[PDB]
Amino acid sequence: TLLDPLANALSHITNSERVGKREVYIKPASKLIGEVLRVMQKYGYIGEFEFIDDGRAGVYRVQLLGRINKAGAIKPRFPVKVSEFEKWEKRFLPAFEFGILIVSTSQGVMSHKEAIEKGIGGRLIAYVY
Amino acid sequence: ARMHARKRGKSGSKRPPRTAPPIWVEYTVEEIENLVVKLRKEGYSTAMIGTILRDQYGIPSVKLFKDPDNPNRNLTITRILEKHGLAPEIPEDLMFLIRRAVNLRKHLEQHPKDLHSMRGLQLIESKIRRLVKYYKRKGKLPKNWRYDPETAKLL
Amino acid sequence: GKKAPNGEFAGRKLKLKRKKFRWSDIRYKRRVLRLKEKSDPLEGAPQARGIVLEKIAVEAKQPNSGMRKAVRVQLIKNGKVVTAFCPGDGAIKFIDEHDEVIIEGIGGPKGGSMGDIPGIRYKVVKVNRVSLKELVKGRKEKP
Amino acid sequence: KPIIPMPRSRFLRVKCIDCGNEQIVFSHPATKVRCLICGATLVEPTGGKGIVKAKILEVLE
Amino acid sequence: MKRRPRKWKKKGRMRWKWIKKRIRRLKRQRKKERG
Amino acid sequence: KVVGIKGSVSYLQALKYLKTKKVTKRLKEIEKLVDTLITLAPYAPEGSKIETIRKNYAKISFNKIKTVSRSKIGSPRIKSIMLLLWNFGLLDVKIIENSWYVRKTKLASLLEENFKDLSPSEKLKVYLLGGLLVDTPARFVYRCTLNGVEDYKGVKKAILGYLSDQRSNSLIIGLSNMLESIKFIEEAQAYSGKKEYIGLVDVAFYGLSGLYLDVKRESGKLTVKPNFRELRALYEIDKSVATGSDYGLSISKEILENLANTKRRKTIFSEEVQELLVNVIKENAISISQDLQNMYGII
RNA sequence: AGUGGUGGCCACUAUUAUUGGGCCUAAAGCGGCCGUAGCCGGGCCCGUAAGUCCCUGGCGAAAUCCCACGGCUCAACCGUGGGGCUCGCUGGGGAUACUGCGGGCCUUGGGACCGGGAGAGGCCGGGGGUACCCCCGGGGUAGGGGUGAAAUCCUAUAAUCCCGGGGGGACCGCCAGUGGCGAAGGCGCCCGGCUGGAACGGGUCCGACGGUGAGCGCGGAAGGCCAGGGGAGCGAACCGGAUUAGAUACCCGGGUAGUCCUGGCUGUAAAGGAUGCGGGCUAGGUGUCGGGCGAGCUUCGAGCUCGCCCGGUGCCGUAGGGAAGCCGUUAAGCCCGCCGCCUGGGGAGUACGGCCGCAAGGCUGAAACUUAAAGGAAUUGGCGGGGGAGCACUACAAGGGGUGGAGCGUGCGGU
RNA sequence: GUGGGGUAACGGCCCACCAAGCCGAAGAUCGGUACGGGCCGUGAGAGCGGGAGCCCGGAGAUGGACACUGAGACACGGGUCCA
């Protein structure tokens, strides 16, 4: 069955990137998936995006620029304070600041560098580089 | 169906993303209230009634018509049935499973050495159990209400 | 499938699974049940003291052919009897019947048989509180 | 595989040959759509689209 | 009777069915000595 | 030999829970089993010839006997419960070639008749007590307990005594059967360490443990102990209707003083139920007496 | 001014694997299905703020630890100052993205219903089939059988063999499949009745009703056992005839249980796709089975040919994975849930115990001690009472020559 | 639970009555083993291992049992008994 749209969508995206396909659709469209996708779009790894209703859950269409090397989902929602980010980054990012992490804090889901800026911890969600 | 057969068969069918009821129809909402009470009062199960409407009356979906009595809800055949107290107490699908189980059990009593039907009995039973648990959670059945072969015979 | 469970609310089965499969290995099981020290003739003693009874030479396992000298010693701490190899060139000439001796492990793999001499587990160090190595070199004198 | 599936089954405004009744009918009915007044069958449900017998004016969506 | 597939190989070793039968003989003999 | 019960040694221990009131799945299984058997058996007024069985008895088909789950019960369990019912004089059971044939007794069809609507645990307790008051082997075991016997050897000496009383005509056969069962298990419980088998002494100790007994295992032995509160209570109940012999074994001084020393315990059941039972047994004592005479006696 | 031996602990070891182990062939998926607790769960709106995060009070002693400076010559040690901890807490405030919690709203997952159609899906009644065996009659002598040869074995009241007629148990060939159906084991003569399931066309009706499954339950090849029937052929044991240094075998002639039927037990296997199950992604082509659509053909029955969609089942194979063998949209690739299993090889599926079974046995299961390997894939050669070839007069097919038989010369061995 | 006794004191702590509760497969009960913590060894670290030495707390005086005096003990250099 389906237990999390986000991980499957990120895996699908990465796979399509390996074959270098140009346009991708994510079937289970949610608000959270849209917000996270906007979040890394802010940093340029993906280009335009759109939502299209289908009368069931909407679909999310993206065109890929093929500059991502791996976009995975951190399933077990590890909560982390401000200080320990470097501990987790070493676990998922290849090098210093190489890409981002996605954290849901009290204000929402946004990048991890910006999270360090505002100094607000939260739940690790996904990573992409 | 994959709970037991594990067969990925896709016999499902398509319903486009239309929100408002179609223009080309003519029947009014109260008109179809009248029609559904007419059809239902001869004893037709709600899926059969919806099929009847789609086929001869040519009305795509009762869901497409908003409930006049509730702006926040869309009109479903069951809600019309209960709008006049003719909605059945025990919901339909589970009653179907009940009667199927009963008739099978008679055949089995006649035929003891058909173990394949024993397996079928186990499966349909587990189906009834699961739906019973579901409705118990949703409170559409008495909590103390139970499936029992004898009362099923009575039903 | 994916190595499971991993749920945020599922640590119990994780540690259960881990602890169960710990029992598969051998060394940790040996430590906790204390099997070595309830089968140890020396009771974890780095050395033991005993009395000599007889001298026997053993045939080196093939393809090594040789008469490796060794002795039979009953130790004083409990009264059990064991075999002890005697290293040294003409070593056996010094050792005699009815000799107080000091014995320790031989250093084979897992303290076991050392190379081409099977069965033996121990070597002698001091005889009558006198180290055997110098006796082999003749620097010291047996009492 | 289309991103959104479409309904291959269409609705039909059809005319009963006997009494000249007008009816909206499904392209893939499941029962015997019987005329309202004359009572003649107009379409018979088959493995795919049921075989229509009356005369067809127009298609809908 | 739990059974290890690797033992089914004959390489330098008597056939496994007869081993199983022989040890069954031993089991019945010892238990009948117990009775 | 006479009782080949295998692989259910601890199964009958569950009846100790009946003394207290903590329900358990085992007890409910026991209750459903026993009353199912009771309905199964008919009470033909006649039946003593080898041919009367199979024409006025009930054949048993074990595979038909099922729990209320459409699950199954190990056949030795059913064997054990039926052995108990016979031993308490409720079921007339006969072992024939690979089949067991049964019928209801006169005690049955009266106890159930008057106590139809009671709770299942109450029905069990009253069945056991009714079996106990009348002259059954269960009564013999109970009297042995009263005389301080707590071992297979005590009950063996009791059985030798009563056969050497020579007035044993009521229960020569059943008591001899009890002796036989004691044979071929006395070694298992004592000499051979492994027990792995059940005799009549065990299915008596269990069955009494549902009223006043607690039993200990040690290398297969079945050491017995009584309490004194409920023991006193049912002793008074027995004195209420003296439809039974001492069997020539009088209560020892120690047991007598312990009974006399102790305080008073609630009378198990409702006093109305106790009185109904009392008068029921009193008015029909002779009929049950002759029934049991035919049952375990000879003439 | 320490170096060496022994013994104990961490690393080495991602040989304990949450970070992070594997389970087709090296040890490692239950024979299959069902399902409880547990674990993990569709989308949207509204409210809480338990978890979650930030600020703030109290509190987590000292000793030990990190850093600067100072005193002891320097250091180690000590002091001054600053920082930290097993961190298991707790007061108040703030935040609502997630998780949890209550209310509502909606179908994609899942379920129900209906229309034709397919299939060795199951049970039950009836009908037949060819074949074999027995029995009766009729015909005809002189053998049949069987092996590599033979022999045992049947027959001259007549065999084998041919014709006529009667009875019996087992089975349902070719059509047949690389086909189908079943969860698995399994399922094949014809007809009638009862019954399970799926796929396809329709979302018609329900609204997350779900995946997994510790403990639980069910059925589940052959064989074995229990009680009663049956027993044509075949055939454990057993009895005879042969071969053989040796026959307890392979071959042959017989032959009991069994193999079948009625009721019950036993829970097994190379029950192996040696691959636990659900969802999403990741190039293709090729045929058949089912269903639907589009056609074209049609002596007009989807009957015949093509493309497409789904469903099942193979082959080839791009990328890719692997020690390789090889796998590769029916994944042994990348993610996502849950359960089972494994931690060098023997000792061992053993001992002891527990539980199950009438019994044989079933399910659980050590340790002592011994060993460097055990094992998996795979290259070259070698070898085959394996195969496929082509050569040979130091081979053989065909001819011809001469020894072993007498004696001499002559070398070797035995004396 | 009731009502009491006893205690520096609350409390089945103890006693009389009333009632049958209480714990358990997120594993009681039973057995094995062991003073707990600050800490210490190792590791890049996740982690694993140990709790002798200094400090805090607990427990003990051959095994058991019992008192007197004392604000404070059932008291290592005070007392009584058994082994």
Tab-separated table of C-alpha atoms (C1' of nucleotides) in Angstrom, chain A residues 70-78 80 85-95 98-102 124-129, chain G residues 18-20 336:
chain	number	residue	atom	x	y	z
A	70	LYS	CA	20.465	12.367	-5.054
A	71	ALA	CA	17.203	13.485	-3.432
A	72	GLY	CA	16.137	11.171	-0.610
A	73	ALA	CA	13.539	11.283	2.155
A	74	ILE	CA	14.535	10.930	5.806
A	75	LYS	CA	11.611	8.786	6.921
A	76	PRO	CA	11.993	8.609	10.712
A	77	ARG	CA	11.403	12.347	11.258
A	78	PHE	CA	14.308	12.864	13.598
A	80	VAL	CA	16.813	18.067	16.271
A	85	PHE	CA	22.914	20.152	12.624
A	86	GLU	CA	26.521	19.322	11.758
A	87	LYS	CA	25.996	15.906	13.346
A	88	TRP	CA	23.185	15.111	10.940
A	89	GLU	CA	24.676	16.814	7.902
A	90	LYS	CA	27.695	14.521	8.045
A	91	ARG	CA	25.215	11.638	8.000
A	92	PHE	CA	23.579	12.733	4.731
A	93	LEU	CA	25.449	15.497	2.883
A	94	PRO	CA	28.677	14.558	1.045
A	95	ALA	CA	30.571	17.737	1.931
A	98	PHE	CA	26.883	20.443	-0.199
A	99	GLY	CA	23.181	20.820	-0.741
A	100	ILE	CA	20.478	21.233	1.845
A	101	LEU	CA	18.355	19.538	4.460
A	102	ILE	CA	14.630	20.115	4.912
A	124	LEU	CA	14.369	16.563	9.670
A	125	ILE	CA	12.267	15.610	6.648
A	126	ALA	CA	14.374	15.021	3.530
A	127	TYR	CA	17.714	15.838	1.939
A	128	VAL	CA	18.856	16.565	-1.597
A	129	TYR	CA	22.209	17.312	-3.204
G	18	U	C1'	20.050	2.474	14.177
G	19	U	C1'	24.499	5.348	11.176
G	20	G	C1'	25.341	-0.185	8.934
G	336	C	C1'	9.206	2.792	0.818
